[PDB]
Amino acid sequence: SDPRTQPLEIRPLMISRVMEVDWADGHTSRLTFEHLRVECPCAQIVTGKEHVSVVEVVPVGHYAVQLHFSDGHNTGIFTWEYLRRLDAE
Numbered sequence: 001s002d003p004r005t006q007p008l009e010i011r012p013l014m015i016s017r018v019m020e021v022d023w024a025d026g027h028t029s030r031l032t033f034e035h036l037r038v039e040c041p042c043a044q045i046v047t048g049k050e051h052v053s054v055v056e057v058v059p060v061g062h063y064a065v066q067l068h069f070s071d072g073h074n075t076g077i078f079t080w081e082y083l084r085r086l087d088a089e
């Protein structure tokens with residue numbers, strides 16, 4: 001019941017390379033495909049993903065989405081809580 005992490009709609013935008021998520025607190029996250037890829041849950045310097053895109057967004061139960069990326073990587077289950085957290089980190 002946390003409005004911050006209840007998604008209303010998800011819009012992966014291929015041209016601008018950002019995934020928008022509207023949340024129940026009225027916030028919309030705009031998370032770049034690049035950012036999502038380099039923070040994919042599935043000191044090092046993680047780089048080289050500026051040209052990667054999200055090819056598909058598949059819901060996982062009610063708690064997460066699986067993002068499929070253009071570099072073949074398709075593990076990466078992102079919980080709603082995690083996606084919201086990426087808006088600041």
Ligand SMILES: [Cl-]
Nearest residue numbers: 030031032035
């Ligand atoms: Cl971002």
Ligand SMILES: [Zn+2]
Nearest residue numbers: 035039086089
């Ligand atoms: Zn980050």
